[PDB]
Structures are given as structure tokens and as C-alpha cells.
Design a protein around this ligand. Structure first.
Ligand SMILES: [Mg+2]
Ligand SMILES: [Mg+2]
Ligand SMILES: [Mg+2]
Ligand SMILES: [Mg+2]
Ligand SMILES: [Mg+2]
Lengths: 233, 230, 232, 232, 232, 232
């Protein structure tokens, strides 16, 4: 009866994130790491550990999978953006990744992390060149005014998914010049499954300003149908 | 330009539920309802509308899909519950279904629906025989305390998913008896996927009090590995 | 030894029906019913028993699986039929279900079941209110010529599958009214596979009197492309 | 309004067989046969006709598909049957096939086909060497003690599917010597689905006289779990 | 141990296997004779590798059953008096073509061409209407050396070296109207790897060849590679 | 026209494509800017060929994202001083490996061995820490001649010729405990085509090499071919 004295957490705290913001190399349970080559044909063919979010960049966790990394790579190489914003930080491995990548492409880029809870960031202070954190609430649209200094072209990425359509209208009006991206990750397929009528009306409300970039918008499951930018249709 | 003059409801509110608690029948957009038989083989084979949650019961939207209904039908026939508690209510279609089914079966059952927002419920007052609504909070257990003098057997069903494991602890200590069910719809495969270490330990904390019922636990994707009892 | 001493029942008698018209709850063999929770993840994920026809309604077996039940629910709620005729009966599970469901909806509806052999039926006689059995050979236009005048709207369901296109020509001329359904369960995808030319033409012969109802024709594997109704 | 002046054949007579015993080549309806190579990539990737049973041997229809043919080709090469009995005939395509293939392999084999209705047979009277058609009723078992005693080894194939287990009980007692095959095409997977208890128990009756030949029993979809032989 | 052996390049056996001779499959992890009393406990998988299991009369067959069915229909329609196969390996398909044309009553001459014939397993006694020819591919003169052959003619590429030039020569010097030129296996791969070059090269033959859509989509090995001469 | 053209052998492009230089994809059947008011009508597929559409800093990449992710992890764990690609093509892999070791801060040299370094597309300025070498995969003297590099080292085989002989050489004269010998793409094909000989050949290295199960199942290019030293 271990339950009778336990206080249990709401496991929803870990929705789509996992339990620990820091990376740990996967650990084999039902097999040796070194398999005998004389019994090579008998060796189990499955992954060996959970395939939920096993990705990393330099000892930091990555919530963007390799297919998403390939898309953002092409997008960065093409646009050569001076600014990449990120609503939703979590552990910050995405922030660091964008920074490292741009550095090697020779793009002078500023990466910006806005979140209401920056406590879980895992980047060391001694590895923060061209990265800026920003405490803020999504619901509050005035969180976003103070990033009207940054240069163009610009990529705005929504990994937070709250008050998102109001944030999209705020950006369109006050932020995005021609060519800039507004990308919503993960959620467009769910909103459209759960709310076809309202979703189509809201998305279509931006028919005069944004468009879906078809070169990138079907190239990874995380970005599926959610990559937009300020360009004429 | 229609984006500026409009202001946007948050679509997260319609998550796993939909835009509207009232039932509306599907409507065809890209094909006539009445396909002519002389061109019978040209007719599209796909369903012709959203497969999201198109199910109903007597004009009330039903979130439990036909496979889950089959499972619960068998559970009711086998266990003949005196009480069905539904945590999380939405449109009330589950409540009216559970009541109608126990009525044709001859079982004397009270259905109970607990939820913080009951405004979405579509059951008319006139059809509430053996159904009781209850407005309360998950995060405090006082909600449930009051009226733990219901007859058994009992089936408790979590459709709210807040403070779930505490509510289950409370349930074993105060409500449940041998043969009663505690059922976690939908969530378990996700909680395991995302927090496996923590979930495993938590579920196994209940090893001396609850067990997974293997006759029902693999029979529906909504009840997948969440049918517990005793 | 055992083989010489037996008479062997022909197994085609049980085609798509099972060995026993009475219901029995499925039984686990390779696992305990109450899996311990400290090994929750170790538990097997498959069903644990045959998926053939394990469906029931109040202790009666159901040959229409849950998805078909959903389609018939919507159709009953929309049309509010006065009569439902089932061609082929077996255990009566559907009959009971149809009557019970119309009762719950407040639809005054008589349910009629027709079969050559009504000995399999399992409905307790004290539970036949608004259910009528007719004994009679399906492949005989006589059986339907002898039926009384029923109330409309009506749903006519073919679960027998013998001499079916003649029965349908009779239905169109003598029974069906605007809005009424002639449903063929199970059989149409097979008839199309084995006889595409003859089937296409035969079905096409009813182009001015029946149409495929597209709201329900693709909503279930059992009713798939077999939901028809009068006019348009 | 063509339905009122039509003669409706029973489509069930075509089950698993088709409309016409005679072969006719498949035909394209929605594309040219000669696709131009300057639009090669635009060309469709799908078969272009019904994939139910488009197989032939020398202008005769073959109900046995290529995978099943491959299994029989090997079984013949290994066993070198002196006799092949095919219970159930239709167009006689597999009869001709069996005779033709055994002839090419240098096997001295007699192909026998039994059926109630031999009218459909499409084999010319002239091309009938080493092939005997018997009249037969699967209900009466002195139809098979109407065997002139043929040579061994012997393959016995069931394509008729009536009174099958009794015809099997008979085969063991009067025909099958060490190594002879009794094959049931098509039915076994469906019988296990519908009557798992009886099927398991009936087959289990023959444990001391027949075994399932695992070299071939998993090798095609039509012979699936249906290939058996004498002893072990 | 590894310190001793000289290692053969395994690329030698690509798409072919280690041994041109046929040997029947052998079960490793089950009895060949499965007891009927535990019939449902029997494993459902093939029980041996499925790389290239097929045979004709004790010779390996690299063309699988679906491919044989297409060639069977082609041969029966077209009635070729010459079948050329560029690339030979074990000779299985060579003997199959000859045997099929023989029971079809067609007067066909099957020709086999290869730089290495040492792997050909056809017995010299079973060689009638078959000619082996040992020449290199990229040298087009190999082919001039025998356009004495009768028509209709089916030319088959199983070697895949310098294929388009060989097709050019064939179009000009060999193929009368109706004749086939088939590329097995490779065209899907060439389109995947070099889509611009492949399309342009295939389109360069638009007034002389077409894709035969009756056979081009009917097997995975022939897939989009069955071409024939349209009148010019 | 065809009789004019001399046709290149498409096998030259096998596994690589026609152009070592990167060009981004373009759409044919859709606009790049899809209008949001038609968002649900937009096509769902990629829009271009998904053969080898990957890149690094304007250079082609043959290793796909999942493979990249396995090499990322490996590099971070192993901190290799020397990485050796056996086969170069366009050099994309070389540049990535060098760039990646640089952002991780690892002091690494990258060597690229190939008979043909002509297709290499790395600009002269960006060659810091990237030594190239001409040589044949038939000399084991090609590999000695490469001066002694620091360890830990990884050895990737992307040429696949005389590989097992090259593996024996590396174990004895080059590889220390924990160094890697990785064979890309090829092992699953060599075990399908030659199961017996591959089983025996790999088996010989049991005392000096293991399979690294942390990485061996994590991508389809590396599938079952990542090795190092110390098992059982
Ligand atoms: Mg993401
Ligand atoms: Mg519910
Ligand atoms: Mg049914
Ligand atoms: Mg082949
Ligand atoms: Mg590779």
C-alpha cells in the first residue's frame, strides 16, 4: 500500500516534454551493448529504448527531430535571417542549435528565447553568445513590443500554442516585413481536426498577408501545414 | 484584412471535444447524397466527412466511440453496477447513454456526473431520471467526499484527467469495494510515453489494491490499458 | 482411432454465424484476468480471444458489429421508421436490438423477422413486444406476397442473400415508398468482385427507382455500398 | 426502367469462380494500351483491370494463382505423383495444367477430376490425354469407392468443400499410403474463424494419420494451413 | 579466424545468390511434419528466407510467379518465334521459355547471351531450341551476328550494361512492329536516381516504342519496363 | 531522336544522382505561396523527389537526417581525433563531419579516400582540417601510406569493394580498442543475397569486433553495420 502515503504529481506537467530537461544517453535494458558477431543474425532489430524524444545537440536535449532540423537548415541557408525568435524555450537546446548553425553558415544572427518559465533552461552562462532570454506571458501582447529592435529577415516560431492567433495578428501588423516567416509547430493539424470551421476562418483571415510556403510545409511532421510567411499568394 | 477586426477564441478550449456540444448531423460537400446506380462503381469510397467524433445517442453527441460502447455494454451486463460515476461531463451524452442502457438491462443504476463547468450539458431537465449533476473541482477532494453513500457495485470513470492519481488514491481509501472499477480513459498511453519512469512507479504503488482487467483493457483504443478494478 | 468413430458435421453450416446461437462471454486462456500493476508494462497488448463475432446486446449475440450499429442508430433517428423488416434472423439479436432502440427513441415501430428456420432464435418469449416472426422460405416470392400491409417509413434489410435481386424488384413494385431503405448487408462487394459485369447491369436496372445513400453507404464495412433507398 | 423486364440469375453461383468458364483476355477502359514514352512518368501505376482472377494456362482460365502454382510445381518435383485427384472441376484449367506440368517433368501421372456438373469443362476432347472426368456426388461416398485403384504416390485436392471431413476420413481408410497428400484449398482459414472449437477438434482427430507439411503449408494464400499428408 | 582467409567480394553474388544450382529449402526451427493436435500452435511465417526460392524442373528461376504469369500471357498472345535473353546466369528462364513455347505449340527459338556461361546448369540433353552465345555487352557487334532470326521476337534485358545504346541498335536493326524490348528490374531505379536523364533518353524513343500497359503494371520485376515497337 | 544520340550508362549515377552540385528543389504542380483561404485544399505530399534531397551549407549530403543524428551522438560520445570516409563523391559528408567536430570543440582531422576525387565540390578556402587522398580499394598499401593518425578514430566504408579484406587490415594494423569500423548500406543486402558466406565472414571477427547496439538499429543506412571491439 505505497499509494496510501504518496502524494502524486499531475503527469500532465510532462505533456510532450518528458520528466527531466537535461539530456541522458539512452540506456539498454534487455541486451548487451556489444553483440557477438558470431551470433550476429540473432541480434534484436528494434531500437532498444523508447523512441519518444531521444534527440540532442551537444549534451542538450532537442525537441525538434532530424526531419525538422533538415527543414530549418534549408530555410536558414536560403533566407539568411538576421533574427530568429522562439516562443517556448523549455531546455533551450533549440536556441543553441539555431545559434550554432547560423554561426557556421556565416549569418550574423540573434536568437531570442521568450517564455513564462525560464527555470528549466540548460544552456551554461559561458555559452550564450547571441542568445537572449526574456521573461514574459503570451496572453500579454506587450511582452512582444520590446523585440521591435531586431533586424530582418526574421523567423518567428510558436512552440507555446496559447493566444497564438492574437500573437499572429500582432506580428503581421508590427513586426514582419516581406519574406519573414511565422511558423506554428505541432498544433495546426490538431486545431483543424478538433475545430475545422473556426480554424479555417481564422487562418483564412490572413489571406491578404500570410501564405503557406509549400517548399517547406510538407517536409516534416512537426511543421506539417504550419509554415507561413509574409508573401503574396 | 479580416484578421484585425476579428478577435480569436482559443482553440485549445475545443481540444478533444469540438466546437459545439450540440449534435449536428454530417453534411456532404463534394458529392450528392443520392448516387445514381447506373454509375454505382464510380462513387467515391471514402467517408465524405470528418471522422473526428461523428457519433450520437438520441440526438446528443457521444464522445465514446462504438468500440468503447461495446466494451461498456459488456461491463454493465456482467457487473450490473448500482452506480456509475462520470468525472468530466461535457455534453451529457455519456450520462444519458449509461442510464438508458442500465434501464433496458433491468439494472437499478444511478448515473452521476461531476464537473466544474456544467454549462455545456444538453440533457433536458425532463429526461434526468436516475441522473444527478454535481458541480465541483478535481484539485480538491471535498467534491467527491460528499455522497460516498451510493450503492455498489460502482464504476468510476475519469474523463477529466486532472489530479488523477490523487483521486484514485482517495477512491481506493474511501469509495471503492471489491469488484468496483476505476477507469482512466485516453490518457494512460500518453502518460507512459511521456513520463515512463514516474508513471510506472505510480501505477505500481497501487499493486496491492488495483489490477488491470485484461478482459476489457485491450478491447477499445479509448480504454487502452486503463481499465482497473478492485 | 478417433477419426473412424465419428460422423463429421459439415462446417459450412456455420458460415459466418458461429457454432452456437447462444451467447457466452469470451474466456482468457494464455493470461490471468487481473494483471498485477507493478508489471503493468509487461502485459500483452492483443485482444486475448477471437475477434470473429464477440458482440452482444443484453446477453444475446449480435452479428452487426459496433460500427454497423452506429450507422443504424443515425438512420433510425433520422427516418423514424414505423416498420423494420429483417430478412434472415438467426438468433434474434438484431431483432431485439432494433425494437429496444426504437423504444428508447420514442419511435412506435414494429420489427419483423423472416426466416426458413426460426429454431435458432434466442429471444425469451416474454420479450417479444413489437417483434413478429414469419416462418417461410426466402427464395420464394410467395413469402413476401403473403405479408400484410406495413406502416411507413420502412427499412428492409437483406441478411439472407438468396434470390436477392428478384426480391428487390418485388420490393420496388409492392412495398417501398419514397424515403424507404433497401439495405443489402455484406454481400455486394463480393458480388461485384466475382461478377462485375452482371452485377453492374443488374444494379443499374434500378437507376430510376433506387439510389445509393452516400451518408451511410461508406460508414461501415458490413453495409459498405449496400445502402439503398427510393427516388433520386 | 430496365429492372421490370430482366431475368435475374443468382450471382451466388459465381462465387469464387466468375461469370464465364471460358477465358477472355483482360481489357483496358481508361487508357491506351500503347502509352507514349514522352509522357512515361505521367502513366498510371495501377493494374488497369479487375485483379480477382485474371490467370490462364494456354487459353484456359486458372483459378490457382501464381503463388499456389509455385507450391504445386515443387510438390510435384519432389513427390513425383503417379496420380492427381482434383475434387471439384469448373473449367478444367488446373486439370490441364497438372497434366501438362507432369508431362514436362517426365512424370507418368494420371490426372482425375470429379464433379457434379462437368458441363463447364473447357478442355477440348482432343487435348484430353491422361485426363479422366468422373461424375460424382460429394454426399455419397461410394462415388469414391467408384475408384479404379490408381497408382501412388497420390495427391488428393479438395476444391468442392462439402462433406469434407468425412471425405477425409474415407481417404485415410482407403487411399492414402505413406507420403500421399490431402490438400484443402481456401476453406481452412475460414472454418477456424467460424467454428474454432469444432475445427480444432475435428482436425485433432487425425493426429495419428495426418500431419501438416510445413515446407508448403505457409507458402501461398490459397493453400494456407491446408496441406497435409500421411504419417507423423 | 579472420587472420587467415582471403575474402571474396560479396558483390559477386548481387541479386543472384551464392550458388547457381538449385537446392530445396530446409526448415531450421520447426519439424517438417506438424502434429494436427497442436495445429493452431504452428508458426505462420514462411520458415526460410524468401530471397529467390523459385524453380523450374530443378533449375533455379530468378523470375518470380507474377513475372511468369505476364510472360505466359505475352507468349500466348504474341507467339514469338525468337526469345532473346541478354544475360543468362543459371539458364532457368531459358529452359522455361522453351518449355512454355513447346506446350503452347509455338515454334520458338530461345537464345541466351552472356560474357560468362560457366554458371549454366541446363543439361546438354535438354538443350533443343536453345542457343547459348558467349559475348560481351558494350560491343554492339555481338548482336548484329544474329538478326537472321524469325519474328515475332521478344528481346529481354537482364544484364543492364550499356542498355540504352543496346536499345537503339535493337530499334534500328532488329525489331519489326509488334516485337518487344523489356528491361527487367532496373527502370524504377534509374528514374529514382537520374530522373532528368532517364526521362529524356526514354522520350528519345517516342516514335518507335511505347509502354505496353496491359503487362507493364502486372509484376514488380517487369514494372514500367515492358516496351514494344509501334508501326514505323 | 535516338539513332543520333550516344547514351550514357545510367549505372554511373546509381546511388548518387546525376549532379554532385546541390540545386534546391522546385515545384511543378503547385505555387510556392499557397493562399490561406484555400488551406485545406492544398496538396499533402512533398512536391519533389525525395531521393537524396539533403544538404549542408550549399553542399549535397548523402547521409539522411536519421544517420546524421546517429553520427552526431557518436561523435559526442567518442570525441574522435580522426574520421576516415572510404569514398567521397561530393564531399558533403567530409565538410559536415569537420564542421560538427568544430562546434563540439573536438580536435579532429577528416580524411577522404577515393579513386576519383574529381566530383568533389568543396571550395579551396573551406578545406581546413580536410585531407584528401587518391587510391584504389584493391591495395592495402593505399591505407598504410596514409600516415599514422591519432585516436579514437572512426572508419566509414562508403565504397563497398574488397571490404572484408579491408576490415582485416584495419583491425590488425590500425584499429585500437573502441575505434569504429562502420559499413554503410550494404550489410542487409549481403545477408539477403549471401546469408551463409556473410554469416561466416563476419563471424571470423568475433574475437576482435562487436556490433554497437546503441547505434546499430538507429538508422536504415547504418542498419546493422556499426562495429568496434569487446563482446560476449
Ligand atoms: Mg516541434
Ligand atoms: Mg466520454
Ligand atoms: Mg451482420
Ligand atoms: Mg528476374
Ligand atoms: Mg550511407
Amino acid at each position: 500500500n505505497d499509494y496510501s502515503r504518496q502524494n502524486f504529481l499531475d503527469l500532465n506537467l510532462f505533456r510532450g516534454l518528458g520528466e527531466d530537461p537535461a539530456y541522458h544517453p539512452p540506456v539498454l535494458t534487455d541486451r548487451p551493448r556489444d553483440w557477438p558477431l558470431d551470433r550476429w543474425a540473432e541480434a534484436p532489430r528494434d531500437l532498444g529504448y523508447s523512441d519518444f524524444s531521444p534527440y540532442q545537440w551537444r549534451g542538450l536535449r532537442m525537441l525538434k527531430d532530424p526531419d525538422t532540423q533538415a527543414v530549418y537548415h534549408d530555410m536558414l541557408w536560403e533566407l539568411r535571417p538576421r533574427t530568429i525568435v522562439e516562443l517556448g524555450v523549455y531546455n533551450g537546446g533549440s536556441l543553441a542549435w539555431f545559434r550554432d548553425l547560423t554561426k557556421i553558415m556565416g549569418i550574423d544572427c540573434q536568437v531570442i528565447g521568450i517564455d513564462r518559465d525560464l527555470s528549466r533552461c540548460q544552456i551554461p552562462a559561458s555559452d550564450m553568445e547571441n542568445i537572449t532570454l526574456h521573461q514574459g506571458d503570451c496572453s500579454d501582447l506587450t511582452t512582444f513590443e520590446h523585440l521591435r529592435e531586431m533586424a530582418h529577415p526574421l523567423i518567428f516560431i510558436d512552440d507555446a500554442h496559447a493566444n497564438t492567433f492574437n500573437i499572429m495578428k500582432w506580428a503581421v501588423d508590427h513586426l514582419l516585413e516581406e519574406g519573414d516567416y511565422f511558423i506554428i509547430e505541432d498544433m495546426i493539424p490538431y486545431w483543424y481536426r478538433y475545430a475545422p470551421q473556426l480554424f479555417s476562418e481564422y487562418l483564412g483571415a490572413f489571406r491578404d498577408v500570410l501564405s503557406m510556403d509549400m517548399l517547406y510545409a510538407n517536409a516534416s511532421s512537426q511543421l506539417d501545414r504550419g509554415v507561413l510567411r509574409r508573401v503574396a499568394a
